[PDB]
Amino acid sequence: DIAHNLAQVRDKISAAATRCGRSPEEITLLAVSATAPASAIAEAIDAGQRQFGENYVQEGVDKIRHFQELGVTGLEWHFIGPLQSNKSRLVAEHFDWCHTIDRLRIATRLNDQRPAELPPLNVLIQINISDENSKSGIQLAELDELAAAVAELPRLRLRGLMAIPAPESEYVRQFEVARQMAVAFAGLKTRYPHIDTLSLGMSDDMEAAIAAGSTMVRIGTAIFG
């Protein structure tokens, strides 16, 4: 049952925040609805969930159009998969957030393809903080330069950072890696305006991510099976 699962995930988020002295409202639950059908998303919507993350552009755009045409208002769609230049226009035209900025060219394409009537597309710069098998995300040493370039794009809004750490079973390493991100996030927040989003943590490392300073957790399986 999707509604029961949302309540259970929101409980674990709330607990983890309270345990480390944070208000549960500091943590956004991003429901990863990739691979789940629109009908299941509609259950989640009926249970109050409003922010959904999609990994593939056409799947995501199809859901977005479906709920727009039902007249369901008030949703926030996050594109959280790797973005190819030949699918940027679809992201720029339909999504509210994109978590995977790791190249200036893709950010500029998104900016150019974003209709002017829409709010600026909220973007996070993706850091490859610890995963040698992934080619997604930049190194931290590239962050200052990329952030400065991205920040000038008027149809984008740089809101913070995202990372997908390498899989890790030890809580200690989960926390230390998440802290590296939180430190980078804090440093960015001092110089840049409206830095408020650290997209960090999934089901298996949710507690360490929240203890370290994440503002947004991405949960898929635990919600949609």
Numbering used by the authors: 3 to 227
From the paper:
The pyridoxal 5′‐phosphate (PLP) homeostasis protein (PLPHP) is a ubiquitous member of the COG0325 family with apparently no catalytic activity. Although the actual cellular role of this protein is unknown, it has been observed that mutations of the PLPHP encoding gene affect the activity of PLP‐dependent enzymes, B6 vitamers and amino acid levels. Here we report a detailed characterization of the Escherichia coli ortholog of PLPHP (YggS) with respect to its PLP binding and transfer properties, stability, and structure.
We serendipitously discovered that the K36A variant of YggS, affecting the lysine residue that binds PLP at the active site, is able to bind PLP covalently. This observation led us to recognize that a number of lysine residues, located at the entrance of the active site, can replace Lys36 in its PLP binding role.
